[PDB]
Design an enzyme around this catalytic site. Structure first.
Site, PDB file in Angstrom:
ATOM      1  CG  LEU A 177     -34.589  18.009  50.334  1.00 10.64           C
ATOM      2  CD1 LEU A 177     -34.695  19.770  50.804  1.00 10.64           C
ATOM      3  CD2 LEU A 177     -32.637  18.964  49.804  1.00 10.64           C
ATOM      4  CG  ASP A 178     -31.594  12.074  52.082  1.00  7.72           C
ATOM      5  OD1 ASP A 178     -33.312  12.372  51.333  1.00  7.72           O
ATOM      6  OD2 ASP A 178     -30.944  11.639  51.935  1.00  7.72           O
ATOM      7  CB  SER A 179     -33.705  11.791  58.048  1.00  7.72           C
ATOM      8  OG  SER A 179     -32.585  12.022  57.979  1.00  7.72           O
TER       9      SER A 179
END
Ligand SMILES: [Fe+3]
Lengths: 122, 99, 210, 125, 185, 85
Positions: free
Chosen positions: F41-43
């Protein structure tokens, strides 16, 4: 064998009523009530004598179930004090008096919760 | 309160995160404001907000990022204050000449 | 270049004030307690009943609280001080509990002396140090900051080192010593009237001048 | 005598107006000593502050100092002196002195006439 | 008239920020940089011989041809010395210019009006919400590219039992008459 | 009677909340999984995960504590140790 105090230091955490996270530092063998008083989130004049007779549940702290297994269980006097000095006469099953919580490295890192303060003046 | 322009991409990212936090915290108020509980899907609303933020990635100017965040916060305040197979070509052709 | 002030007091016609209140912090002395006229209690100093603050010493609790407990003796020419925060993260106020005897040239700063303690002269207790209950430090002992003196023990040396454990008979003598210096302090106390007669001297000086 | 009222509701009459003005002007000179000498702001400040200090030292009555200065309202003078102190503090806090080099300023002057009946702020006599 | 404190300012004001000056009978003009506008207005307001202590107004002008289309103008007055002064800067759509609410408390509503009409944001405004147009207005009406009649119009929708906003469909379109004479230049 | 949520219930609720994301998959989710690496996933994904967790548990998470919720184990510990959950 230098016999410093950092070994006796026990570091734990406390979330007070409004939800602010606090860091509490207390010596091993000194009670959680004393540690919280030194931190400053419990009124020192509210609770002065660290005795069950002088405790009116002003040192009550809610502790997590996974931490209740690391300290001795509640005594009959402690349970009676919790039952009597409460908004409703029930046992919270997660709260213990701060007088009988003897801090130690086993309890180091414990997270406690400080409920809404109660009046104590007369 | 309005802040000076972000001088770094990291600062712009932090401001974007703060704005997304504000939107997420203000989402349940919109629930009682609009009352579309049948097909709202608060999770879907959060996903749509994230999708808007993700489709606004082509921008790289910190000034444009700050202006977009300012307008997004303004839109959030407005919403809180309750202010609302024949191919694509052939359908437009049957509709009107101007397409 | 330094500029001397012409209106600088080279003679105050009165020595250092025994009590120096800083801001709203007024030093408190119990009526039963005896503080010698030569001492200087400045700031947040609290001396309780039976304390025996001896001549020539100074207690400057301006940075943090200084507390002298019941029947506690602080002897001649010692220095007591405190500061914000300590190396041990514990409260850094200077606390001296009941039945604690403290020698002549003791240099105390941010100490947490538990009750019934004996501390010799030329003893230095830096910040964060605590001497636990029923313990003895002999003369000349210096404890590094954050070092603790365990209960029921005798310690010595310029770096604090354990010498030997304390027998019960030796432990029971600490309150006896505390009350003995308390009795000597009571003997010293009777020589002071509630109000000094120096104001007669200053009025005579004023009349002589005009 | 004593000034019953200064007319301005915000302003209040001060009894020791001369002493307050003397102190403010002395502090003005002491603070403006820190400004670079080449700057015209320092020269103008020294000029008018020295003139005002001299006239308020020579004349004792506040009526006399007002009449000789021609500005009037020693309370307004005190307000101006306090604002001058604030401005000097600001120009010490930030440093605007000195041309930035390779600097150009476009002075524009047009003599386009205007009719005599448009609102133009007439100079005081 | 009354070009006294203008000349005195140019004599005493630091030369760093005076980008250009105009001596006119239509109003003395100062044009500076957006970085030093707050300092320049602080100097003028506080100095004892240029006391422009009242802010008349803040205006915006749109110049689509220039790189910095927006021109922010400040009309100030000196009642003690009885003269008007003008201080202006150039700002574009995205850049934020300094706010002078702290100096002149009246500047808050004019700065909000400038935001509303053009889009020039201010750095230290206590708040910068829209003031004049409708709630949820999308564009900036006073921009030259903004159409005169706007983009949306309101009407009462009976099934919705509320006033809804729909894209403009106005009858009798605006008739722009080109009166300009080719010999006017 | 009762001030803290049960550890098993908190773990199950956090796992279920994580499972309700389109990008994540039930195969790669574990009680000890880093949001950025294990879940891929990402920020913004992590921020939205934290917001979803706090919405499910009905209490606001502080900024620093939320920043320190980069793992499912950290989330479970924080939720089980908070009295407002
Ligand atoms: Fe208790």
């Amino acid at each position: 064998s230098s016999k410093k105090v950092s070994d006796r230091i026990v570091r734990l955490s406390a979330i007070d009523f409004e939800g602010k996270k606090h860091e509490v530092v207390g010596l091993a063998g000194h009670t959680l009530l004393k540690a919280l008083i030194n931190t400053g989130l419990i009124d020192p004049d509210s609770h002065r004598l660290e005795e069950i007779d002088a405790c009116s549940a002003h040192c009550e702290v809610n502790i997590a179930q996974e931490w209740l297994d690391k300290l001795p269980p509640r005594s009959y006097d402690e349970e009676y004090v919790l039952v009597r000095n409460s908004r409703a006469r029930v046992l919270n099953k997660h709260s213990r008096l701060g007088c009988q919580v003897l801090l130690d490295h086993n309890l180091q890192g414990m997270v406690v919760a400080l409920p809404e303060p109660k009046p104590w003046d007369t | 309160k309005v802040l000076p322009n972000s001088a770094s991409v990291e600062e712009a990212r932090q401001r974007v995160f703060d704005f997304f936090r504000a939107t997420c915290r203000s989402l349940p108020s919109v629930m009682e404001i609009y009352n579309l509980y049948d097909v709202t899907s608060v999770a879907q609303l959060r996903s749509t907000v994230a999708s808007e933020i993700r489709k606004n990635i082509g921008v790289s100017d910190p000034k444009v990022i700050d202006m977009l965040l300012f307008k997004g916060m303004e839109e959030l305040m407005n919403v809180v204050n309750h202010s609302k197979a024949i191919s694509p070509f052939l359908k437009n052709f049957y509709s009107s000449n101007y397409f | 270049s330094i500029t001397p002030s012409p209106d600088r007091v080279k003679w105050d016609y009165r020595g250092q004030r025994k009590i120096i209140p800083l801001g709203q912090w007024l030093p408190k002395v119990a009526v039963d307690a005896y503080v010698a006229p030569n001492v200087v209690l400045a700031g947040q100093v609290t001396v309780w009943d039976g304390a025996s603050v001896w001549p020539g010493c100074v207690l400057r609790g301006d940075l943090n609280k200084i507390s002298i407990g019941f029947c506690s003796n602080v002897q001649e020419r010692s220095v007591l001080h405190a500061a914000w925060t300590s190396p041990t993260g514990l409260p850094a106020d200077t606390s001296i509990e009941r039945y604690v005897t403290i020698g002549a040239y003791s240099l105390l700063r941010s100490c947490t002396i538990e009750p019934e303690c004996i501390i010799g002269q030329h003893s230095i207790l830096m910040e964060g140090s605590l001497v636990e209950t029923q313990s003895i430090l002999e003369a000349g002992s210096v404890v590094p900051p954050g070092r603790r003196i365990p209960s029921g023990e005798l310690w010595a040396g310029n770096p604090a080192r354990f010498v030997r454990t304390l027998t019960h008979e030796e432990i029971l003598e600490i309150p006896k010593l505390a009350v003995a210096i308390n009795d000597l302090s009571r003997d010293h106390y009777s020589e002071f009237l509630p109000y000094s007669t120096v104001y007669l001297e200053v009025e005579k000086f004023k009349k002589s001048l005009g | 005598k004593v000034k019953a009222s200064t007319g301005i509701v915000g302003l209040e009459v001060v009894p020791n107006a001369r002493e307050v003005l003397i102190g403010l002007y002395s502090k003005t000179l002491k603070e403006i000593q820190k400004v670079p000498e080449d700057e015209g702001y320092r020269k103008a400040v020294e000029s008018f502050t020295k003139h005002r200090l001299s006239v308020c030292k020579e004349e004792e009555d506040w009526e006399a100092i007002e009449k000789r200065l021609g500005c009037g309202q020693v309370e307004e003078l005190i307000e101006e002196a306090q604002d001058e102190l604030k401005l000097i503090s600001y120009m010490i806090e930030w440093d605007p002195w000195g041309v930035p080099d390779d600097y150009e300023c476009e002075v524009i002057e047009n003599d386009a006439p205007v009719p005599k009946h448009v609102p133009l702020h007439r100079p005081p006599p | 008239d009354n070009q006294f404190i203008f000349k005195y300012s140019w004599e005493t004001l630091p030369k760093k920020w005076v980008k250009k000056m105009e001596r006119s009978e239509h109003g003395n003009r100062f044009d500076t940089k957006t970085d030093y506008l707050f300092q320049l207005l602080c100097f003028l307001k506080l100095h004892t011989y240029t006391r422009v202590q009242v802010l008349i107004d803040i205006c915006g002008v749109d110049y689509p041809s220039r790189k910095r289309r927006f021109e922010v103008v400040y009309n100030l007055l000196s009642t003690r010395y009885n003269s008007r002064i003008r201080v202006q800067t150039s700002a574009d759509e995205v850049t934020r210019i300094s706010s002078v609410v702290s100096l002149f408390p009246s500047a808050g509503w004019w700065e909000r009006e400038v935001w509303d009409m053009f889009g020039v944001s201010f750095i230290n405004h206590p708040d910068l919400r829209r003031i004049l147009t409708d709630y949820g207005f999308e564009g900036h009406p006073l921009r030259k590219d903004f159409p005169l009649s706007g983009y949306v119009e309101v009407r009462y929708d009976d099934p919705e039992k509320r006033v809804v906003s729909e894209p403009i469909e106005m009858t009798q379109e605006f008739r722009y008459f080109d009166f300009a004479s080719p010999w006017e230049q | 009677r009762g001030s803290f949520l049960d550890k098993s219930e908190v773990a199950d609720r956090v796992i279920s909340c994580v499972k309700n994301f389109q990008k994540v998959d039930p195969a790669k989710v574990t009680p000890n999984a880093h949001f950025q690496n294990d879940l891929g996933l990402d920020s913004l994904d992590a921020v939205e995960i934290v917001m979803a967790l706090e919405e499910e548990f009905g209490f606001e998470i502080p900024d620093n504590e939320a920043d320190k919720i980069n793992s499912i184990k950290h989330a479970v510990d924080f939720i089980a140790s908070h009295p407002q959950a």
